[PDB]
């Protein structure tokens, strides 16, 4: 119906109640209701972040790709897409994504500390 934004933030707040409590699988479905009412960078990026703790890397990339269509350059989405790639053995794409973070935010520990593991894992991936 109308006012789909009003529940798209409130269902996300129920997801954040579950996420801080340690029910990430309950957080994913709460964010999925949210995106089907009003799709946001916030709900896609948080859905992908919950999937990382569920080991659902190939689901997590699909919501990260949607973030890059709204915010082309989003550091959180590139950090999470590169993390999903690292665990999918898609490191060949992750090296590039961590560089797209570090050009804007050279302070990102999660970017540079993962890059040092990606560069060696590529040299091992023969």
Summarize the structure.
80% of the residues lie in helices and 0% in strands. With 126 residues, the protein is mainly α.
Describe this structure in words.
- It is a single chain.
- It is built from seven helices and no strands.
- The chain is mainly α and 126 residues long.
- It has one domain.
- The PDB classes it as peptide binding protein.
- Keywords: HSP70, HSP90, eevd, MD simulation, R2SP, dynein, assembly factor, peptide binding protein.
- The assembly is monomeric.
- NMR structure of an optimized version of the first TPR domain of the human SPAG1 protein.
Structural class: mainly alpha
**Cα end-to-end separation:** 53 Å
Beta percentage is under 5%
Cα gyration radius (Å): 15 Å
What coarse outline follows from CA principal-axis ratios?
A: elongated
Reading the helices and strands in chain order gives HHHHHHH
**Range of helix content:** over 70%
Largest sheet: none
| Number of DSSP E strands | 0
Q: What is the count of structural domains?
A: 1
H/I helix tally: 7
Organism: Homo sapiens (Human)
Function: May play a role in the cytoplasmic assembly of the ciliary dynein arms. May play a role in fertilization. Binds GTP and has GTPase activity.
Protein name: Sperm-associated antigen 1
Subcellular location: Cytoplasm; Dynein axonemal particle
